[PDB]
A = this chain, B = another copy of it.
């Protein structure tokens, strides 16, 4: 039973574990045959001693195989099974476009997502701003949507890398979250359960990012590329900026609106376009729907610009019990805040910094996020019309438009926002939106 202690001792002393050892230990996490403190202790030895590529691959494959793994050869799709994952951000709406776009160019995209965690908005909370939108279809409904529409964005079912449930739960109370190979293992366990042929990872950089410094973000990205490819899934990673809000809006309904206007062509945020297109390029190339970058981009502009991508977003929503006509009449269905007013800076000058962590928090404090489950989310609140880094601010140029349920709520977000945007007399250095492509 507690032969796990043996596996702990072996790693406490700086020796590599083997597949059977790792497999054993994981399967015991899943089965409850292994104690909490035994998970904590193993976790903390890995934080101190790290892991090697064969360990990392073994740990991911073992957590991935601890629950269901989706099988697609059964349905003879003529294209690649591909997905994308993001360490999260504020305004990180990219998936709502990216799925449809890739589907539009041949990909089959089974996107299992999650809810807002901490200060970052989660995709499922955004899609559930769409009335009747159902993130939990059954196998039949689900496979059919992927076969017909080509993309679906569903919640995490309990059968998905359940070893990770307890593993992460213990990590998060034992100061053992901050370990690249452990992070890499939980992230990839899930995404690989999907049965992928290819994957792209969007690793955020900056004030509103998971990892605090660029090089740590790089480190995680490199690790994920290595392990995922190591696991037999062609994978690339992009390091993308999160030093300001990526969309022009933050929230739930307001982000769904932006996604639709992006796909139809009503409006495209320049920074959001870059990060979105590049991630879409990667999936295409990796899934072999394109030779190089230009053939990828050309095909992706194509479906952006002939309505095919907006069209397939519309079908997906229709498939998952959303409104039939949602793309055409999104304002008919998206909730509206009771109160919508601009907030203005106190000084003149240029925007030099944005505390994105804090903006993310402020949206949660308005009801966009839940502090604890069984909190009902207000889907109408958020920010729109964000000022951006570099921008010149005066009295008639607002920092954002804040959407609140009442004035007390509004005033509080106003304060948060003014506090989180710094202005200098000097216009600052430019920030690229994509920093680095990373490949095997």
A-side residues, CB < 8 A to B, are: 14-16, 27, 30-33, 48-53, 56, 115, 128, 131-132, 136, 138, 155-159, 212-216, 218, 222-223, 225-226, 229, 333-336, 338, 367, 372-378, 405, 429-430, 432, 438-440
B376 touches A52 (CB 8 A): yes
Specify which of B14, B15, B52, B223 is in contact with A131 (CB 8 Å cutoff).
Answer: B14
CB-defined A-B contacts under 8 Å, sample of 9: A14-B336, A16-B405, A50-B128, A50-B131, A52-B378, A138-B213, A158-B213, A226-B374, A374-B440
What 3 pairs between A and B have smallest CB-CB spacing?
A226-B374, A31-B430, A158-B214
Alpha-carbon distance A229/B305, docked complex (angstroms): 50
Chain B residues closer than 8 Å to A222, beta-carbon distance: 373-374
With A14-B335, A53-B375, A157-B215 known, 8 other A-B pairs at CB within 8 A are A14-B131, A50-B128, A50-B131, A51-B376, A52-B378, A136-B215, A136-B216, A158-B215
Q: By the criterion CB–CB under 8 Å, are A159 and B214 in contact?
A: yes
Q: How far is the CA of A336 from the CA of B215 in the complex (A)?
A: 27
Write the nearest CB–CB distance from A36 to chain B, whole angstroms.
14
**Bound state CA distance, A50 and B129, in angstroms?**
9
How far, in angstroms, from A132 to B128 measured CA to CA in the complex? 42
Closest Cβ neighbor of A239 among chain B residues: B158
In the complex, what's the smallest C-beta–C-beta distance from A382 to chain B, in angstroms? 14
Closest to A432 in B: B32
Enumerate chain B residues within 8 angstroms of A215, measured Cβ to Cβ.
115, 136, 155-158
Quickly give the copy total for this chain. Answer: 2
What B residues does A159 contact at CB under 8 A? 214
Q: A30: which of B223, B338, B429 is its contact (CB, 8 Å)?
A: B429
- Tell me the smallest distance from the CB of A214 to a CB of chain B, in Å: 4
A49 contacts across to B, CB distance below 8 A? 131, 335
Partner of A438, one of B53, B155, B374, B429: B374
In the bound complex, how far is the Cα of B138 from the Cα of A33, in angstroms? 40
Among the interface residues A33, A53, A212, A338, which one has the most CB atoms of the partner chain B within 10 A?
A53
- Give A17 to B440 CA distance when docked, in angstroms: 41
**Which residues of B are found within 8 Å of A432, using beta-carbon distances?**
32
Which of B155, B223, B372 has a CB less than 8 Å from the CB of A226?
B372
B429–A131 touching, CB < 8 Å: no
Q: Which residue of B lies closest to A27 (CB)?
A: B429
Considering the chains assembled together, what is the distance between the CA atoms of A359 and B3 in angstroms? 38
A193 CB to nearest chain B CB (Å): 14
CA distance A376 to B214 in the complex (A): 18
